Design an enzyme around this catalytic site. Structure first.
Site, short mmCIF file in Angstrom:
data_model
loop_
_atom_site.label_atom_id
_atom_site.label_comp_id
_atom_site.label_asym_id
_atom_site.label_seq_id
_atom_site.Cartn_x
_atom_site.Cartn_y
_atom_site.Cartn_z
N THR A 79 109.59 14.34 137.77
CA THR A 79 110.28 15.43 138.41
C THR A 79 109.41 16.64 138.73
O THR A 79 109.93 17.63 139.23
CB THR A 79 111.54 15.85 137.62
OG1 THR A 79 111.11 16.49 136.42
CG2 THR A 79 112.48 14.72 137.37
N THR A 80 108.14 16.55 138.38
CA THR A 80 107.15 17.57 138.76
C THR A 80 106.05 16.83 139.49
O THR A 80 105.83 15.64 139.31
CB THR A 80 106.57 18.24 137.48
OG1 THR A 80 106.10 17.21 136.56
CG2 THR A 80 107.55 19.12 136.82
N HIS A 104 113.49 21.37 130.42
CA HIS A 104 113.75 22.15 131.59
C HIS A 104 114.96 23.02 131.29
O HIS A 104 115.91 22.52 130.64
CB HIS A 104 114.02 21.26 132.82
CG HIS A 104 112.98 20.25 133.09
ND1 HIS A 104 111.99 20.45 134.02
CD2 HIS A 104 112.68 19.08 132.49
CE1 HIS A 104 111.17 19.41 134.02
NE2 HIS A 104 111.58 18.58 133.12
N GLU A 122 118.13 18.99 135.04
CA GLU A 122 117.64 18.31 136.26
C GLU A 122 118.63 17.32 136.74
O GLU A 122 119.14 17.38 137.84
CB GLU A 122 116.26 17.69 135.97
CG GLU A 122 115.18 18.78 135.64
CD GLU A 122 113.87 18.41 136.02
OE1 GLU A 122 113.39 17.36 135.52
OE2 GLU A 122 113.22 19.17 136.77
N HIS A 141 113.18 15.91 127.91
CA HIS A 141 112.56 14.70 128.38
C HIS A 141 111.56 14.23 127.36
O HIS A 141 110.56 14.92 127.09
CB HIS A 141 111.83 14.97 129.69
CG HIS A 141 112.79 15.18 130.83
ND1 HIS A 141 112.42 15.79 132.03
CD2 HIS A 141 114.08 14.87 130.92
CE1 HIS A 141 113.46 15.84 132.81
NE2 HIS A 141 114.50 15.26 132.16
N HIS A 184 104.31 25.60 133.33
CA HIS A 184 105.52 25.00 133.97
C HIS A 184 106.61 24.65 132.94
O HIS A 184 107.77 24.59 133.30
CB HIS A 184 105.11 23.72 134.62
CG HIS A 184 104.04 23.89 135.62
ND1 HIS A 184 102.84 23.27 135.56
CD2 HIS A 184 104.06 24.58 136.78
CE1 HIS A 184 102.09 23.67 136.60
NE2 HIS A 184 102.86 24.39 137.38
N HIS A 229 109.18 17.62 126.51
CA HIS A 229 109.31 18.92 127.04
C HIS A 229 110.73 19.14 127.50
O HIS A 229 111.54 18.20 127.51
CB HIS A 229 108.34 19.17 128.20
CG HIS A 229 108.61 18.24 129.34
ND1 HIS A 229 108.06 16.98 129.44
CD2 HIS A 229 109.51 18.31 130.35
CE1 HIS A 229 108.59 16.36 130.47
NE2 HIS A 229 109.46 17.16 131.06
ZN LIG Z 1 110.73 16.77 132.60
#
Ligand SMILES: [Zn+2]
Length: 257
Positions: free
Chosen positions: A195-196, A93, A103, A116, A61, A91
């Site tokens: 957010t996941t 996005h 995000e 993040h 992911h 990590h």
């Molecule tokens: Zn994140």
């Protein structure tokens, strides 16, 4: 199982994780004209001098850079926080194109990517306990725009070839996360969620106003990563962002005028 596709992407998550439609979901659009300055907010204290990175992992992911969180080595305090929060991982996005990938959004502007830095509240003893608490995590979010290269990111970029597919990891020692931070620590803050999946409502978000710049070549290397495992059909790891969720009964506070 869950992902970012037509068939398993954000619009589907609520069937497995009904908290997806909850009252404090993230990310959100930050409307800079309605965020109120809060003079009671303290400056952020980011204390990363002793941070001990261990490993980098492709989880299917994103990729996570993991830290040793078994003592107070890298901690976030101050700002909107009570107490001490320990860095566990960071990590990103990102998008398929430079016009999307973040995000959070700022006045509906999407950045090319978002970092993040995830921290857990030490009063809960471990991460797994902390995510069950409304004040369990603090996530520092930093936007990425495409322009000049970020020197401090290059070590990450050049290991990505070794973790191309899901489940691959590599030793990643002696990485200093201070080199990913912008000059200013001015921020917005609001209560939200992961957010996941599992989308738990355990996060105090701290989103920095000033983006970092990365180069087109850097971001291009992120987009060569794979969501799939080795020897499966290749599906590029791009567009691993959740869209903005309703703000509901929340206020976004600014640390600056
Ligand atoms: Zn994140």
């Amino acid at each position: 199982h869950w992902g970012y596709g037509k068939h398993n992407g954000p619009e589907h998550w609520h069937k497995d994780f009904p908290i997806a439609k909850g009252e404090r979901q993230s990310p959100v659009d930050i409307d800079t004209h309605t965020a109120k300055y809060d003079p009671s907010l303290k400056p952020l204290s980011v204390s990363y001098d002793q941070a001990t990175s261990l490993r980098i992992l492709n989880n299917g992911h994103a990729f996570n850079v993991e830290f040793d969180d078994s003592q107070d080595k890298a901690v976030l305090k101050g700002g909107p926080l009570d107490g001490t929060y320990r860095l566990i991982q960071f990590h990103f996005h990102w998008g398929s194109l430079d016009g999307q990938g973040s995000e959070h959004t700022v006045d509906k502007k999407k950045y090319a990517a978002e970092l993040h830095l995830v921290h857990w509240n030490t009063k809960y003893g471990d991460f797994g306990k902390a995510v069950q608490q409304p004040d369990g995590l603090a996530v520092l979010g930093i936007f990425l725009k495409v322009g000049s290269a970020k020197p401090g990111l290059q070590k990450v970029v050049d290991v990505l070839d070794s973790i191309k597919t899901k489940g691959k990891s590599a030793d990643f020692t002696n990485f200093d996360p201070r080199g990913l931070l912008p000059e200013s620590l001015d921020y917005w803050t609001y209560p939200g969620s992961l957010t996941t999946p599992p989308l738990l409502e355990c996060v105090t978000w701290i989103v920095l106003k000033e983006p970092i710049s990365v180069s087109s070549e850097q971001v291009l290397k992120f987009r060569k990563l794979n969501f799939n495992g080795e020897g499966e059909p290749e599906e590029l790891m791009v567009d691993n962002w959740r869209p903005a969720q309703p703000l509901k009964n929340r206020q976004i506070k600014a640390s600056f005028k």
